[PDB]
């Protein structure tokens, strides 16, 4: 680990990945099938 390492920024990656919008829709679809 160093000042010039890859240094992942998870919140920035999340927004860049559209807040995982398709995963959110998939999660929602699975959730309402419960029971």
């Amino acid at each position: 680990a160093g000042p010039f390492g890859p240094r992942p920024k998870c919140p920035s990656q999340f927004v860049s990945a559209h807040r995982l919008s398709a995963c959110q829709k998939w999660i929602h679809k699975q959730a309402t099938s419960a029971g």
Binding site: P8, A17, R19, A22, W26, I27, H28, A31, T32, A34
Partner: protein
């Protein structure tokens, strides 16, 4: 069909835009967002919501992550 549902594939492509060690944290955030925005409250639905999110790296073959650990549901 042997190909996955198109929506699942779109999700896996989005997950691949993140580093492995960010995937579980961001999926927890995504699950919380769905749960609140959609008003999911029925216990089995809430449990299945968070479980689905935690399994998505494995559903997607994100081998470097596996299944995300359980965290208490809000």
């Amino acid at each position: 069909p042997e190909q996955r549902p198109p929506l699942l594939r779109l999700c896996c492509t989005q997950l691949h835009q993140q580093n492995p060690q960010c995937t579980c944290s961001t999926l927890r955030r995504a699950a919380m967002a769905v749960r609140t925005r959609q008003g999911i409250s029925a216990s089995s639905q809430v449990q299945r919501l968070f479980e689905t999110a935690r399994h998505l790296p494995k559903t997607c073959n994100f081998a470097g992550v596996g299944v995300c650990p359980f965290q208490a549901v809000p």
